[PDB]
């Protein structure tokens, strides 16, 4: 009984489905890996290395997990290289299968299964409880339609039914905008939380589990990814610990044409309606608010490139280390600086809106970073020493994207190629069957 | 016209002489080597590494010049190891030198010198223009009465006489608590704001002119050494952005018994009278603003440790490398790391209000420091490998102040009984001659 086909509500909630359809006017999709390269090389071996683009409006969440690199050009439900999880936190037809299905059946197999069943753009079923006969009549009736959000919002001691109205508001949103992993033989999306939700916590998880996402193809090191803790990083902000929620900035009460008011719904950047969000509170104009978050921005920027190029020399180190002879016991501590490192630097930026949410603690955290890579590179130059090589390790071009990725061996050419040929070719199969079978208009 | 003793004003203005007076309450003097023996070795060779204390109350400042194992226990005029600049922040007898012989003529010898001379507590004409007829009618007609003062605020094209009200407010507070350095044959005060108040921006100052406070013993570095730059960093953070000036926490204005206003002069703790100073622009509570402060203040501290051991490590290498013969060619690369990480560490931590007044900008200098100790680290495993040393560098043991000190060559005992002996008797013959001389009541 939940209901994925978002234009069924359209009739009965115009003004939240209006603005909600308009995330589809933020459409730039930016490369982020041609904006810096460095990246290919921290990621080399995992798929971020070959398509990592920045965010754009939730109207695309299905169309950039099907185009994207990263999933691949899977022949068939049996294939391509990642999980039914991938589809997770894309549309409101995990919800629907999560129900069918359960929790375990929907995580069994690969992305490529999912295709013909998850395809409405994320919508009213992922915030609502849209069965409730009170949300025809107007009211929200806010849910956690993922299970595995709910059991991470009860570890860190705010089960989501006591909460109150205002803590829901951006439990919502930390259905989708918080650091996971994939964990068991199903790879079901769980979230590190059961420590607390500090970088000193989530590692502790990690470590205590010995878990990896991935082994770096130059260093050989066991790493883990973050990915975007907007959840856990307002929660440390001064916004979040002054109870200003997502919706306060994402979401604004707006007025419509008949001067009803209603939660705006074109989630996005809240500078653009500066006098519903900011001005609400705050008495200083939009330039000067603009201009601190700028300057926030690129003081992070500037401090998390010198982190990123104390790990890329660190990763082709280690490399020189291994070609060298360099044993596992030779390595071992190294890769736990590597780890630890990318790790803390990951976290710390991760989020495209930590200069904004909590910009203290994502300078605090690129500190802590840049410590443990100073650890890893003098323990390198130790080691490089006794294999008798006491030079600076000169690193490959990676001036490009391009570069950056023939040199960790990516053949980006024919990677491309087959991608190109799967949307072309595949996508229109999966549209066609969700079609027949009720599932898409 | 300048009236150093304080006490002349008590009869015209009772409510802001007691309020004055009553710094020396604040009497607490914390022993910072203590709590931090790292700093011995950072500070190798400086007269920091022998005593440094946390502040305490303005009524003390004459008396910790006069105590601190810094200014040494000269026997006459000639002798010790500073110059007549110290005396500079402690007292209005400055003002009075100053005017009476100069700047030059105050400024030329050294510290022993002004002995029975520099003898009334930091009070009225530091900061007020008292011969001003408006000043006894209740105006405070602010002033800035060091010169050196006046042309660094012309320099951040800020000139004092047309400043508004509340910017002379926080650079009255400026003539003192800045960064500053020595300058020139007489050592003259003088604050490296040329460029701007910007870390980045002082470096590129004393860098121009190669100019260094003194060379590390251990790593034979040039070194910058810097001083409670709180008007450089308050200007950087979000209520100096906001003209909130250090009045409006340090100084509130406050009512006397009969209800008439007045500006409280026991410059303090402002949580002491939060219902008068946060509290008249915040809604939240005194422990929740204490809790938020206190934690960036572990942030700080945390990552401030961090950046030191660091630090500590990279000086004994180098002294290591030095030891296994390492030219000066080849240290100077080494060298100019060692330099910049601690110059930037330094800065970031040297004023104690800094998790208060700007938390971002201190995390920010301590994640730059960090990438410079970094390389040093790294050229130095490097420079130790040409040597045939392929081993960690094993540091003494400095778990203590007195370790530490001893680990650097310092007699303390010896130190401590000169500086007990010259307490002893040399203060009283200047207190007691500046008495005969009508300088001291
Ligand atoms: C399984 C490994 C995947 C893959 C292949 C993708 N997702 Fe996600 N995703 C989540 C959130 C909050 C965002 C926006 C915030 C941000 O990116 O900073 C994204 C974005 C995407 C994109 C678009 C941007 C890009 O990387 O190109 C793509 C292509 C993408 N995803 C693929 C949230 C989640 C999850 C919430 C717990 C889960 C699980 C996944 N994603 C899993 C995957
Ligand atoms: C798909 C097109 C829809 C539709 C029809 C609705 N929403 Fe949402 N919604 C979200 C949040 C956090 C709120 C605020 C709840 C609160 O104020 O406490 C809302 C609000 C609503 C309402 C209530 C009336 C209103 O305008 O405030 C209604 C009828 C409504 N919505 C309909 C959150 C989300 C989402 C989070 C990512 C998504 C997606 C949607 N809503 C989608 C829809
Ligand atoms: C709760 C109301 C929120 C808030 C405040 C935001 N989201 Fe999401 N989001 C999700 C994914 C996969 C993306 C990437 C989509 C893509 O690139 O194709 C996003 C993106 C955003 C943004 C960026 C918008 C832009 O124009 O850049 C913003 C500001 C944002 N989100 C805020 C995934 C999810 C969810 C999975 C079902 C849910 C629930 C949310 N987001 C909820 C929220
Ligand atoms: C509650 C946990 C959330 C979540 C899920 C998001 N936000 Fe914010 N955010 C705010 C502003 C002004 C920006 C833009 C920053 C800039 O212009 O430089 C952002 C950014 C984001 C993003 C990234 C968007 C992108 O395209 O990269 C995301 C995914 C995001 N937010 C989600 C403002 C605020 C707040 C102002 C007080 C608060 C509270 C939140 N955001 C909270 C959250
Ligand atoms: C719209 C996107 C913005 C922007 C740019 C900022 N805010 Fe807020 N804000 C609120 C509260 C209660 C505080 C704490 C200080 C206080 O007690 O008043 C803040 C703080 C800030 C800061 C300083 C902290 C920092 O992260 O550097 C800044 C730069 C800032 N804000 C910018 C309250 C609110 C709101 C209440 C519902 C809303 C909406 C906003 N703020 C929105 C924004
Ligand atoms: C302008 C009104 C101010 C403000 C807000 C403060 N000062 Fe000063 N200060 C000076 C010296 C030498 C010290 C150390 C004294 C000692 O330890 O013996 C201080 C100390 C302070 C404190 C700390 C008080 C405490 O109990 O810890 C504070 C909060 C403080 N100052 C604020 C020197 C000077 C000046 C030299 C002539 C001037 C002018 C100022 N300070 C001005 C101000
Ligand atoms: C304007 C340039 C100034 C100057 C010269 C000073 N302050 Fe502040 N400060 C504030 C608070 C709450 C503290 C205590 C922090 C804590 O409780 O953990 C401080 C600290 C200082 C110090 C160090 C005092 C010590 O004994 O260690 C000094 C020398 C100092 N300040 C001087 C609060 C504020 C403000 C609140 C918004 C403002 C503005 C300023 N201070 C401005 C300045
Ligand atoms: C007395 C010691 C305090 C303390 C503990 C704090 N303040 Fe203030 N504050 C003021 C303004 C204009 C802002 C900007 C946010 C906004 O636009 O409202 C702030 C911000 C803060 C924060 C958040 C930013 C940060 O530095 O982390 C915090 C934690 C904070 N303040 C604490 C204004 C004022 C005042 C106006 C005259 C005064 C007084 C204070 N603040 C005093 C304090
Ligand atoms: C331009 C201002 C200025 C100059 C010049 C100056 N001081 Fe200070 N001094 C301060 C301020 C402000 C404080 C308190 C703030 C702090 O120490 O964090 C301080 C604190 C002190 C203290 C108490 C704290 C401690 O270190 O034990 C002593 C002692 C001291 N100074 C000695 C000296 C000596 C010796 C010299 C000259 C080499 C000197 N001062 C020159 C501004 C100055
Ligand atoms: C280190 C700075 C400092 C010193 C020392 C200092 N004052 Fe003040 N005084 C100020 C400041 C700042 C103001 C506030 C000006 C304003 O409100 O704009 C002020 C205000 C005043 C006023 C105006 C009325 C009022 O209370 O606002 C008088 C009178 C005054 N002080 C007298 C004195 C006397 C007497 C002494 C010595 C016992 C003294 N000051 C020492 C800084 C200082
Ligand atoms: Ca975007
Ligand atoms: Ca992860
Ligand atoms: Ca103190
Ligand atoms: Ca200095």
């Known amino acids: 009984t939940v209901e994925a086909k978002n234009e069924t509500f359209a009739p009965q909630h115009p003004d939240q489905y209006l603005s909600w359809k308009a995330t589809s006017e933020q459409s730039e999709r930016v490369d982020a890996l041609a904006e810096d390269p460095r990246l290919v090389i921290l990621w080399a071996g995992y798929p971020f290395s070959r398509d990592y683009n920045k965010p754009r409006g939730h109207a695309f969440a299905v169309t950039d997990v099907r185009e994207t690199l990263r999933t691949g050009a899977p022949k068939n439900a049996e294939d391509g290289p990642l999980p039914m999880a991938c589809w997770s936190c894309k549309s409101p037809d995990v919800a629907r ?8 059946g929907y995580f069994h197999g690969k992305w490529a299964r999912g295709g013909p069943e ?10 609502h409880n849209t ?60 979230f590190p939380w059961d420590d607390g939700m500090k970088v000193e916590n989530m590692e502790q998880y990690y470590d205590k589990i010995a878990f990896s996402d991935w082994t770096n ?23 979040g610990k002054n109870n200003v929620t997502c919706i306060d900035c994402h979401m604004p009460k707006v007025q419509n044409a008949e001067g009803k008011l209603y939660t705006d719904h074109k989630i996005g950047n ?10 609400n509170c705050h008495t200083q104009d939009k330039a000067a608010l603009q201009k601190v978050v700028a300057e926030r921005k690129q ?26 002879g360099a044993t596992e016991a030779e390595m071992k501590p190294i890769q736990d600086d590597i780890r630890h490192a990318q790790w803390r630097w990951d976290l710390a930026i991760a989020s495209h809106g930590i200069h904004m949410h909590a910009p203290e603690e994502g300078l605090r955290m ?10 890893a590179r003098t323990k390198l130059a130790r080691l490089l020493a006794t294999k008798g090589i006491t030079h600076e390790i000169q690193i490959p071009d990676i001036s490009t994207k391009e570069k950056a990725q023939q040199a960790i061996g990516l053949n980006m050419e024919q990677i491309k190629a087959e991608k190109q040929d799967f949307i072309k070719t595949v996508i229109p199969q999966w549209e066609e069957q969700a079609r027949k079978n009720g599932l898409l208009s």
């Open 97 to 104: 299968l999560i129900q069918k299905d359960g929790e375990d």
């Open 118 to 127: 998850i395809v409405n753009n994320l919508g009213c079923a992922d915030c």
């Open 131 to 190: 069965a409730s006969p009170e949300f025809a009549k107007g009211k929200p009736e806010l849910t956690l339609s993922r299970p595995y959000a709910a059991r991470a919002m009860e570890a860190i001691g705010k089960p989501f039914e006591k909460a109150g109205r205002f803590d829901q508001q951006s439990m919502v949103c930390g259905q989708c905008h918080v650091e996971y992993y994939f964990d068991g033989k199903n790879k079901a999306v769980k």
């Open 217 to 239: 193809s130059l260093s050989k090191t066991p790493m883990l990814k973050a990915q975007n803790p907007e959840y856990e990083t307002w929660t440390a902000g001064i916004h």
């Open 270 to 279: 809240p500078f653009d309606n500066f006098a519903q969000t900011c001005a």
């Open 299 to 324: 003081s992070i920027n500037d401090l998390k490139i010198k982190v990123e190029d104390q790990l890329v020399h660190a990763h082709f180190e280690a490399k020189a280390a291994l070609d060298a």
């Open 366 to 375: 690129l500190g802590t970073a840049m410590d443990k890579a100073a650890d």
